[PDB]
C-alpha cells in the first residue's frame, strides 16, 4: 500500500511541469544554496599550471511546482526523473576538463522534501586552472581559485549562496591533502560578480593557499651549487706552480656547474623570465667563471716553472692576487648568500 | 505571471520547424558573433597548434521565436537548443574541440522579444598554426581562428563581428608564460568559389616570444664558455697539459650544452637561429684549440730546422672575431 502511494506520487510530480523554465521566471530570483566537500585536493601540475580536485558538490533550492502530500517527508528520484526537472547550470569558470562520475551508476542524488525544497548532490572531478607567479621559485606561495556560477542565468534570475557560514561551507577532508610537492595551508571562501557580455553573474569562489616545500631544492640544486663554488675558491690555496692542476680544477668545476644548471632547469616549467633559482645558478656560475680568470692572472706573473722543494736558487713568492682572492671571493659569495636568503625568505 | 510565460513558450514551438532557416525564401540571415576568451592554455611548437578556451556566442533574429507581452528576456534551459535552428558554424583550424559538459552542457538560449536569440558555448578548441621557427627564439608568430559556415552560402547566411573591433574581448587579460600578444585583428570576408561566396570570420593574434629566458640559459653560458677557451692564450706553450685541458674540456662543455639544449628545447627538426649560434660558438672553441696545435707544431716540430707572435696575434683577433660574430648575428635576427 505504501509502495502504491509512492509510485502514485512519482507519476504525478511532473504532470504540468516544464523543465525549460526557471522556478519563478517572472516572480522572484532563485536562491541556490551551495556546499562543497573536498575529498582529494589532487596533483598540482606546475607545467600545465593547473590542479585537480575531487568534490561532493551539493546544491539546494526551492521549486514550488514539486510540492507533494504523502506519508513520507522526502523523495528519492531516478536519474530518468532527475533529468526531467530544472537543475541550475553550474559550470566552473576556470575548469579545463572536468569529469562527472558515473561508476557504477551516475553519482547524482535529487531529493524532494514536502515543501518542494530540492537537494542535489554530485560527485565531481574538476581539473581547474591555477595561474602562478613563479618569480620566487621555489620559495613562493600562491592561491589556486575554484570559481563556479550559473552559465545562462544572470543576477536577476539565479543567485548563489552557501548553506552555512562561508568559512564552514567548503570542508576539506582530513585525509584529503594528496600533494607531494606543496603544502595545503588553508582555504578562503568568498563570492563575487562578473560583468560578461551577457550580463552580471554571481560567482562563488574558493581559494586554496599553497606553499612549496623547498627541502628538495636545497639538497638537489642549492647545496651542490654551493659546494662547487666552494671548490673553485679552494683552488686558491694551492701553489702557483700547479699549472696543470689548477687548470684541470678550473674548467671542470665550470662543467660541474654546467651539469647542475641543465638538471635544475629540467625540473621546472618553461617560464620566460628569471626565477629565484635562475638568479642563484647564474651568479654561482659567475664565481666559478671568475675563479679560472683569477688563475689566468696568477699564471701570467709566475716567472718560474719549478716548485718549492721542502728542504730549501730562488723561488716564487705567493702572489698578492692569490692572497687577496682568498679573502675577497669567499666573502663576496658569503655576502651574496646573506642577501639571497634574506630577500627571498621575506617575500 | 508564470503560467502565461509557460503558455508563451509552448506556442513559440507550436508548429516550429527546425529545418527552416529564418526567412527561408527571403534575405540571408545575419549572424553576429561575439567571443569572450577565457584563456590560451598552451602554444605548442612541436604540434604546431594552440589551445583556446572561449565563450563563443552567436546572435541572430528568428521571426518564429518572437513574443509580446512579457517584458523580460526569456532565458531558457540549454536543452531547447536541440529544438531550434542553430547555424552550422565550424572552425577550419580545428584539430580537436569539445563543449564543456560539467555540470551540465554549457549552452545557453536567451530569447529576446523581437525574436533575437543568443546561443552561447564554452568551447575549448585546439586550432592549428603554420609556425615559422627559422628565427627561433627571436621570432614573432601569427596564429588564427577561422570561423566559417558549413552548408549555406552568402545567399542564405551572413556573418559579422558584433561591435566591430570590440567583438573579441579578454585578449589583454591573457598572460602567456612564454609569448606576448602584440595585436589581435578581426577580419570579415566572403570567400568566393566557383559555386558561391562563403562567409568567413577571422580572429588572429601576434605572438612575440619573450627572450629573457633564452639569454640566461642558452646564450650567456655559451658566451662564457667561449671566453674560457681564450685563457689558453695567456699561458706559455711549455705548459702543454694546461693548454690542452682548457681546450679539450671546453669543446666538451660546448658539447654538453648543445646536446642537452637539444633535449630541453622543443623538437623542431630544422635549422633555427639558436642552432646557428651554438654551432658558431662551437667553431670558436674548436679554432681556439687548433691554435695550440699550430703553436705546438711550429716550436717542437719546426724548431731544429715565431711562437709568441702567434699567441700575441690570437689574443686580439679571436675576441675581435667573436665580437664581430655577435655583431653579424644580433643584427640579422634582431
Amino acid at each position, epitope marked *: 500500500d505504501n509502495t502504491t502511494v509512492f509510485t502514485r506520487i512519482l507519476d504525478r510530480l511532473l504532470d504540468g511541469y516544464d523543465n525549460r523554465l526557471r522556478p519563478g521566471l517572472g516572480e522572484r530570483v532563485t536562491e541556490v544554496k551551495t556546499d562543497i566537500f573536498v575529498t582529494s585536493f589532487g596533483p598540482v601540475s606546475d607545467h600545465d599550471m593547473e590542479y585537480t580536485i575531487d568534490v561532493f558538490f551539493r546544491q539546494s533550492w526551492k521549486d514550488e511546482r514539486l510540492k507533494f502530500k504523502g506519508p513520507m517527508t522526502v523523495l528519492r528520484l531516478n536519474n530518468l526523473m532527475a533529468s526531467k526537472i530544472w537543475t541550475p547550470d553550474t559550470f566552473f*569558470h*576556470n575548469g579545463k576538463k572536468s569529469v562527472a562520475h558515473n561508476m557504477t551508476m551516475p553519482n547524482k542524488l535529487l531529493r524532494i522534501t514536502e515543501d518542494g525544497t530540492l537537494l542535489y548532490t554530485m560527485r565531481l572531478t574538476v581539473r581547474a586552472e591555477c*595561474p602562478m*607567479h613563479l618569480e620566487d621559485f621555489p620559495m613562493d*606561495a*600562491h*592561491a589556486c*581559485p575554484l*570559481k563556479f556560477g550559473s552559465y545562462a542565468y544572470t543576477r536577476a534570475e539565479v543567485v548563489y549562496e552557501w548553506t552555512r557560514e562561508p568559512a564552514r561551507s567548503v570542508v576539506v577532508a582530513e585525509d584529503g591533502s594528496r600533494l607531494n610537492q606543496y603544502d595545503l*595551508l*588553508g582555504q*578562503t571562501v*568568498d*563570492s*563575487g*560578480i*562578473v*560583468q560578461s557580455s551577457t550580463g552580471e553573474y554571481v*560567482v562563488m*569562489t574558493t*581559494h586554496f*593557499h599553497l606553499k612549496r616545500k623547498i627541502g628538495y631544492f636545497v639538497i638537489q640544486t642549492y647545496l651542490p651549487c654551493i659546494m662547487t663554488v666552494i671548490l673553485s675558491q679552494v683552488s686558491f690555496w694551492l701553489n702557483r706552480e700547479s699549472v696543470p692542476a689548477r687548470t684541470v680544477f678550473g674548467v671542470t668545476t665550470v662543467l660541474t656547474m654546467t651539469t647542475l644548471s641543465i638538471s635544475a632547469r629540467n625540473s621546472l616549467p618553461k617560464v620566460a623570465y628569471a626565477t629565484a633559482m635562475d638568479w642563484f645558478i647564474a651568479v654561482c656560475y659567475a664565481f666559478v667563471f671568475s675563479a679560472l680568470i683569477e688563475f689566468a692572472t696568477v699564471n701570467y706573473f709566475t716567472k718560474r716553472g719549478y716548485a718549492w722543494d721542502g728542504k730549501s736558487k730562488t723561488f716564487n713568492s705567493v702572489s698578492k692576487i692569490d692572497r687577496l682572492s682568498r679573502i675577497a671571493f669567499p666573502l663576496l659569495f658569503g655576502i651574496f648568500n646573506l642577501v639571497y636568503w634574506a630577500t627571498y625568505l621575506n*617575500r | 505571471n508564470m503560467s502565461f510565460v509557460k503558455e508563451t513558450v509552448d506556442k513559440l514551438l507550436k508548429g516550429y520547424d527546425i529545418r527552416l532557416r529564418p526567412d527561408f525564401g527571403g534575405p540571408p540571415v545575419c549572424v553576429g558573433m561575439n567571443i569572450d576568451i*577565457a584563456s590560451i592554455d598552451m602554444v605548442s611548437e612541436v604540434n604546431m597548434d594552440y589551445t583556446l578556451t572561449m565563450y563563443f556566442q552567436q546572435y541572430w533574429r528568428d521571426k518564429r521565436l518572437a513574443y509580446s507581452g512579457i517584458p523580460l528576456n526569456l532565458t531558457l534551459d540549454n536543452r531547447v537548443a536541440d529544438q531550434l535552428w542553430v547555424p552550422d558554424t565550424y572552425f577550419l583550424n580545428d584539430k580537436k574541440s569539445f563543449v564543456h559538459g560539467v555540470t551540465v552542457k554549457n549552452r545557453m538560449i536567451r530569447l529576446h522579444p523581437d525574436g533575437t536569440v543568443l546561443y552561447g558555448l564554452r568551447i575549448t578548441t585546439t586550432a592549428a598554426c603554420m609556425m615559422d621557427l627559422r628565427r627561433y627564439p627571436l621570432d614573432e608568430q601569427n596564429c588564427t581562428l577561422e570561423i566559417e559556415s558549413y552548408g549555406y552560402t552568402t545567399d542564405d547566411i551572413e556573418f559579422y563581428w558584433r561591435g566591430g573591433d570590440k567583438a573579441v574581448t579578454g585578449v*589583454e*587579460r591573457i*598572460e602567456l608564460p612564454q609569448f606576448s600578444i602584440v595585436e589581435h585583428r578581426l577580419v570579415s570576408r566572403n570567400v568566393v568559389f566557383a559555386t558561391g561566396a562563403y562567409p568567413r570570420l577571422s580572429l588572429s593574434f601576434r605572438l612575440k616570444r619573450n627572450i629573457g629566458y633564452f639569454i640566461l640559459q642558452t646564450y650567456m653560458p655559451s658566451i662564457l664558455i667561449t671566453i674560457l677557451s681564450w685563457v689558453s692564450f695567456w699561458i706559455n706553450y711549455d705548459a702543454s697539459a694546461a693548454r690542452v685541458a682548457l681546450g679539450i674540456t671546453t669543446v666538451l662543455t660546448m658539447t654538453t650544452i648543445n646536446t642537452h639544449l637539444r633535449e630541453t628545447l622543443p623538437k623542431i627538426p630544422y635549422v633555427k637561429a639558436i642552432d646557428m649560434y651554438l654551432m658558431g660558438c662551437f667553431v670558436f672553441v674548436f679554432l681556439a684549440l687548433l691554435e695550440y696545435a699550430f703553436v705546438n707544431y711550429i716550436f717542437f716540430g719546426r724548431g731544429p730546422q715565431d711562437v709568441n707572435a702567434i699567441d700575441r696575434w690570437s689574443r686580439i683577433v679571436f675576441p675581435f672575431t667573436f665580437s664581430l660574430f655577435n655583431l653579424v648575428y644580433w643584427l640579422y635576427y634582431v
Partner: nanobody
Amino acid sequence: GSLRVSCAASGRTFTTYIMAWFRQAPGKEREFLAAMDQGRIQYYGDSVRGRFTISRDYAKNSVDLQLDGLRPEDTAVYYCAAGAGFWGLRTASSYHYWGQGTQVTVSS
C-alpha cells in the same frame, strides 16, 4: 556627489595580479573596499557593496573605483593595492604593492 578615484600603475604589468582598493579612516584600520581578480570578478566589502564599483583597464594597466552615494562617513584615505592575495582578498598583509593615498573629504 560622485567621484572616480583612479590608480595608474607603472613598472610592472599587473594583469595577472589582483588590484584592490582599501580605506583607512582615523582609527588605523585599513578596511577592504573592492578588489578584482584577473577573471574580472568584483569582490566587495559588506559595508560598501552596491555603492562603489570597481573596474580594471588591463591594457593601460590601471584600476578604477567609481564612488557613488558618498555618505559623510567616507572621509578617509583610499589606498590602491596590487597583489596576488595569499590568505588574501580581504587581508591587508597580502598585497605587496601600495599606492600613495588620496585624502577624500566628504562634508555635509
